[PDB]
Symmetry: C2
Subunit: 655 residues, 2 copies
């Protein structure tokens, strides 16, 4: 297969095929299926050597995960593309892999044709001859102590559509089928003691035709707002490499994390300074809050159990991205080992972002004034996880900051509610017979920093009143306050939470350098405020399977391939065992001061559904920012042409 | 004078003149000057009666504040415009009023010509013949126990420009002159024990000509991004009344609070439902963190001591607002009693705001999909407070939410730093010989709610784990969590702070109504996270003068004219006494449950300066949101034409 331009480029359709052919041969005569075929990124050290020390081009490797009929668990390994050969392989019989769209799509037809499920539909008020009106979102079983990882299992959240164009979510059924993914048979059905038959109300729909019938008619089309860039865009791409407003970075993508930003640097007037080696979302967990059975099984780790890549929406059609867009496609392997493509998986573009900065002199009534508008570069993707959509926006700014914006939209995870049943404290009745359970949306931002070079550290920064009292010579008027910096020496020290009491922020800095003006080390500060405490209790399924979610910040030593905090194979893992973040933390004694570190940030929101969220919910925003603090010696955007600028002398001169 | 269209319209230039003429007559033969001439808004009850009960048009009143030469303090009163007569008047001899641009502009020339100040400049390294190069930002003295309110005083933060086009902030002087505003003489100069002469370095400038000399040259002009609305805008204004996407409200404006949004309602498919009666910023306080003398005097309450109206920038020229803009002008009175106008004080426009909502069905690979873009309505203003600029954005959204965005920009408040002096823990050395002190920016959002009608209440909402333990029948897997609602019965109960531990939010609801689906009362939830604790200690000047800043939330009974939390006349008030918020709180026993209430929210940021903030700082964002929760029975924006929408049947039908 042909080598890619960049060592970090995703595998090409050709590499994917080359890889699967190679694997198929190695397992000649075996009935195998492909779960994952993806780039095994080069070692950090080797990449940097290649990039800045004229070192050799790293070997082009493919990581694969396959299933073999009649064999428990999975088999994984590495394929060396240059020599078309398996160079590493092993079997993991007590593990279950990520669920692909193929894995998911087959489940619905099998429950529709299962006698037991059918009987349950009839009991629920649905004629056995109308099973084609029964639907289901096939989820991982998450984890169920009755089966462990002994069988690859899915749990089906069953719904009903009276018409194929309805939004099924207003009509959930009360039971839950457990399906053997690689046997295609229902092995058990969780049935509640309290039975609730199908809602007899009409579906809560949202397409225009439905709206016209529900309310009067649609609103008149609104006067258009057109955005044009007649002279082109200011950013430049060379393959997957981006260059914009002094930023230079590589836009990668994979089945699991979706967008992966690597080798990020800023051109400080000729001095090209590294910022991050790699940054992305490494895991998620959406824990529901009803303690009732079998709702404990609702705490999807979407990234690790489905993949933000595999689930990504093709962005072109929807008009998801406005303006002069540049797209990237994604390529994966299918069960058969053939490359599959999702067109326009990532969308890139720049847009106006308000004021960058402004200042006027009151002396001549603001005649003396300078105003510079801000423009941002946005690398985006949007993925669907059954009922919900996650809109991801990586944003680069002209003040050197990098921001991650997320918008939650889509549809509420709903369960059935009896006519006189109280949605209790665990959920909300958002429509007759519909219970939308409380749940949190937590994300794990993985940052591999290289702040102004190698050798980094992290610290918590808390605002505090001077400890001296009001009236003391040291704090006569009691207004004194400072920022207390606690730099993490050991892993244990980094396990910290956001604290509103100190308006806490965290710094990722380079202790080996010093800002010539402030005398502080150069840094990027994490300013993140939407940091929910993990509500599920210690020892809970949720807490055990997502060890990283317990703290807002987790800093561990760097090691090649420390990507996924809940383990490499998340589905059906009980949470017991030393793996993922639990393994990286170890006894918490390892050094993380002035070395190669990994910074995992947990953030997100706690969602208590309200009717406004139904039947389709308005976007809910989440954001975090990484700001350069003491990184530059002055505002880095002053050499950007102002939108307006009048000097005091010019103001005078102007009559 | 001619009556305005709307009872809430600001006084017209004609009304202002009519008012001052009337006042001048009442005080015939007296040497008086005008400090404030502004609308005295009609009583809440009368306005509502006029608006919805066919009641009489309220009397058109003007509130005034004047100074009389040789008389201590001020005189204030009300003028009935219809009968051109003073209907209420009184003298406040122990109070000092807001400082107008006129009040401020004269100070600089008086320090330049003061022998003592000159001597100090010479001592500081500035030839007495170069006083024209000496400048100063005239601040309120804030409060100084040496003079109280006995004399109207200003404190001058002295700076030096080697050229009139420089940004003086890189060159502060070490001393501080105290000036008698209404005597135009320096009465004292605070001189430090440690003397620091003028920085001999070059000014840290930021205009293009300066940048070309500092770095290579400016960056090339970037390819334009043009925004056009060929068919006009979707919003409609009738005078100061706005109608947009079902929202209807009145855009008011005054010298102090700047923009004032009133009589806000949402047209819920024919049912016009009130939301807020009035919402605005009622006060601010920017407390600095150096305990050293005379820096305690730096804690400007900008809104009450200068006025977000009086300080507002004319928005046209700067290209501050992009797109098809609609402007409003502001009118005030000058010292002489003559109307003054600031053109384009408020700018209004609508723009794209990303996705409103989206959802695709994985069953046909997202062929089945609906996407609706969001557009927002923005009412904005930008004001300059000496060195800093505050960019205010009131934003209305298509999901029924209202958001307040603020962007801090402008220049750091700087003081001189000795060559070998440590900016200590109280500030940052952002440039040679420049110390930018730590400080917080706190705002007081005043909300007079009328959530779906009259009779409102407020409550804190905290997310919590079920109190039942892991393994109990009630919480077998320990994932249970709910939202604990503590509704405030008494004023005392409302004094609460944001708490990250419970991801706290506050609800303003109508206990007299119930959402037919959720069974909860209709409400607007305050989702605000940038809520710094007040760092200045209890009993401190800061804490005493800004009683409202101690808590994130303060809810008091409504009373006509309870607008300004730090009192009507803020400058030089010691903070002792029962007035403002301290008065409204009283013994904290008054009822605030299901009645007419006022909700004051304290929010903002804590700023620890970094070199990136100098010599001009990049915009720093602050935001808070009011979301309808249980207000509607379903997503209110579903009748907006989707940007794209394919039904499942249409997807099939499409080959
Ligand atoms: Cu949610
Ligand atoms: Cu600041």
């Amino acid at each position: 297969p042909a080598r890619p331009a960049h060592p970090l480029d995703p595998l090409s359709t050709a590499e994917i095929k080359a890889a699967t052919n190679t694997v198929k041969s190695y397992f000649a005569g075996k009935k195998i299926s492909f779960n994952t075929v993806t780039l095994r990124e080069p070692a950090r050290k080797a990449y940097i050597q290649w990039k800045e020390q004229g070192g050799p081009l790293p070997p082009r490797l493919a990581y694969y995960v396959i299933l073999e009929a009649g064999k428990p668990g999975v088999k994984e390994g590495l394929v060396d593309l240059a020599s078309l050969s398996v160079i590493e392989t092993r079997a993991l019989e007590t593990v279950q892999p990520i669920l692909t769209v193929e894995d998911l799509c087959s489940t619905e037809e099998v429950i529709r044709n299962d006698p037991a499920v059918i009987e349950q539909c009839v009991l629920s008020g649905i004629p056995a001859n109308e099973m084609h009106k029964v639907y289901c979102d096939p989820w991982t079983i998450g984890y169920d102590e009755r089966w462990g990882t002994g069988k690859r299992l899915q749990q089906a959240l069953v719904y009903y559509r009276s018409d194929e164009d309805d939004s099924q979510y207003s009509h959930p059924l009360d039971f839950c089928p457990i399906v053997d993914t690689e046997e295609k048979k229902v092995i058990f059905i969780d049935i509640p003691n309290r039975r609730r038959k199908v809602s007899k109300h009409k579906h809560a729909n949202f397409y225009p035709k439905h709206m016209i019938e529900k309310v009067g008619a649609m609103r008149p089309e609104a006067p258009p707002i057109n955005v044009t860039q007649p002279e082109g865009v200011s950013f430049k791409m060379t393959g997957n490499v981006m260059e914009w407003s002094n930023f230079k970075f590589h836009i990668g993508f994979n089945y699991r994390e979706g967008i992966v930003l690597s080798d990020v640097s800023y051109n400080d007037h000729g001095n090209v300074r590294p910022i991050f080696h790699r940054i992305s979302l490494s895991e998620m967990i959406v824990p529901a809050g009803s303690p009732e059975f079998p709702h404990q099984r609702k705490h999807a780790l979407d990234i690790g159990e489905y993949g933000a890549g595999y689930m990504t929406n093709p962005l072109s059609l929807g008009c998801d991205c406005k303006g002069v867009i540049h797209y990237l496609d994604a390529h994966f392997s299918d069960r058969a080992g053939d490359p599959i493509t999702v067109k326009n998986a990532v969308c890139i573009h720049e847009e106006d972002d308000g004021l960058l900065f402004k200042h006027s002199d009151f002396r001549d009534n603001f005649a003396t004034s300078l105003v510079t508008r801000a423009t941002k570069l946005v690398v985006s993707q949007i993925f669907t996880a059954a009922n919900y959509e996650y809109c991801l926006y990586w944003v680069f700014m002209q003040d050197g900051a990098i921001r991650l914006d997320i918008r939650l939209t889509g549809i509420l995870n709903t369960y059935i509610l009896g006519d006189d049943e109280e949605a209790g404290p665990w959920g909300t009745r958002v429509y007759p017979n519909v219970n939308a359970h409380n749940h949190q949306h937590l994300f794990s931002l993985r940052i591999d920093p290289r702040i102004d070079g190698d050798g980094n550290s992290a610290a918590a920064c808390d605002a505090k009143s001077s400890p001296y009292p009001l009236g003391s010579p040291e704090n006569m008027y009691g207004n004194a306050f400072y920022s207390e910096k606690t730099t993490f020496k050991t892993v244990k020290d980094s396990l910290t939470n956001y604290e509103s009491a100190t308006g806490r922020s965290w710094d990722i800095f380079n202790p080996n350098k010093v800002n010539p003006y402030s005398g502080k080390p150069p840094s990027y500060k994490l300013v993140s405020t939407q940091c929910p405490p993990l509500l599920a209790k210690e020892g809970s399924l949720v807490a055990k399977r997502a060890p990283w979610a317990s703290h807002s910040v987790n800093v561990v030593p760097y090691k090649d391939n420390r990507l996924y905090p809940s383990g490499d194979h998340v589905p059906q893992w009980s949470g017991d065992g030393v793996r993922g973040m639990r393994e990286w933390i170890g006894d918490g004694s390892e050094n993380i001061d002035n070395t190669d570190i990994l910074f995992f940030h947990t953030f997100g929101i706690t969602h208590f559904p309200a009717p406004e969220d139904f039947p389709l919910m308005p976007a809910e925003p989440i954001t975090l920012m990484l700001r350069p603090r003491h990184f530059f010696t002055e505002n880095p955007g002053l050499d950007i042409q102002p939108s307006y600028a009048m000097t005091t002398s010019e103001a005078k001169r102007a009559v």
